[model samples]
Target: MEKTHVQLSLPVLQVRDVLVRGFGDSVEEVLSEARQHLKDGTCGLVEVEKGVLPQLEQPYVFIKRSDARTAPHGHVMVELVAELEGIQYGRSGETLGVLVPHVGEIPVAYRKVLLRKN
Candidate 1:
């Protein structure tokens, strides 16, 4: 018997920014909390399992928030920017070629989990 090796190229895509809106009075407060978590080295968990994607598997942190406002009905629309570091191979299984996202602004967030200040 002989052993053979194979090489694979992981798929790469430019993650797009995610826009989230909801009714709340403490939108900024929520976002602030999430940011704190990022700074303290924590992973934001998504509500839906399927929502988790390759771009989100790696270590990511909240970068910034833009265009935040409270609606008349108490709704908030926020634009968030997140960054992912290193490369994520697969959801589970064998080891493939490593592909890491560069250190910069990359849109990635399944669910908003910003850190709250204590």
Candidate 2:
């Protein structure tokens, strides 16, 4: 008997957001909050201008490419943002917090069944 090998490809989804906080405070607090909200799907699309708040810590959040992938043709960049909410501390806990067009004619690759062999 002989064994056959197979290759498989899967579709991937990427999400992006920015982190915001007040002065004298750590972004960790905000991040923790955002994570919880994410699980509940409460956070929505963050606004660029209104998303971040200013504070004395010179509290300005900067944007960065969280993840990126490169292929033979081009590259894809993913940005991340944090949603804001009330903060919880101690045993209690606390936390913080796209459009597309249609095309006429295009050629696409469709994979019915991709197989992977170990």
Candidate 3:
């Protein structure tokens, strides 16, 4: 009795890495203090002329176009702003604080809102 063997061919499985390299910390955590306050009715929407929300740093706060996306609008390279503290003042001299680094662009379409720590 003679036995015959047949050759078999298989397709190569293509594999690729989708992980971001050396950019682990590049993606930042965004703070939405004012957004949450506005939804809760605890924060007040102030006039453009009256709004003064800026603070100091080891960090530069980024005010994004919408809370829905993490991408910066144009050129604000936010190194650190997620850890910023919100400010709370009184009515007579009332002011809301949402600190961002100097020269950061706050879009004209952006509305000014007052937020407090409490």
Candidate 4:
């Protein structure tokens, strides 16, 4: 099979070498952390499966886009965002757009409203 190339805002990076890097943290059985935390939609609840994910020292996370024609498994869609918020691209050409998550910090409320439990 032929190799595929995807465009990214970072310019020079190994997309396939970021995610799946086991996160042992430090000492013996590991090295680095699972760097990126991609949330296409439901990564928060994804169950761990053997052989389903990749394995590397420096792994980055990713999410699948609506378009299924660019990247592997039809998730070629991603958005790239600039640090200054001056430039942005993705979801326009139906391509993969990886927008680095931006926020101040954890919101005031994490858990939703619920009645008192016994």
Best of the candidates, lDDT: 1
How many clashing residue pairs are found in candidate 3?
0
TM-score on alpha carbons, each prediction: 0.22, 0.29, 0.19, 0.18
What is candidate 1's CA lDDT for residue 32? 49
lDDT of 3 by residue, 71-102 (tens): 23332211112322343121122112233211
* 1-118 per-residue lDDT for model 2 (tens digits): 3233222221211113222222123555444443343334332322233423332122212222322333212222222232234332222111111100112212132211111111
Sort the candidates on TM-score, descending order: 2, 1, 3, 4
How well is each residue in 1-118 modelled by candidate 4, as lDDT tens digits? Answer: 4223332222112324233333343322221111132222111111123432332321222222333343444323433211112322222332221212222222222211111110
Q: Model 1 Cα displacement at 61 (Å)?
A: 12
Task: Report the lDDT tens digits of candidate 1 across residue range 43-116.
Answer: 23322234434534333323222223422232122223322344321122212111123333332433232211
> What TM-score does candidate 4 get on C-alpha atoms?
0.18
Question: Per-residue error at 13 for model 3, in Å?
Answer: 63
Off by over 4 Å in 1: 1-25, 47-118
Q: What's the lDDT for candidate 3? A: 0.24
Candidate 4 regions exceeding 4 Å error are 1-6, 9-50, 54-60, 68-75, 79-118
How many clashes in each candidate? 9, 14, 0, 16
Better model by TM-score, 3 or 4? Answer: 3
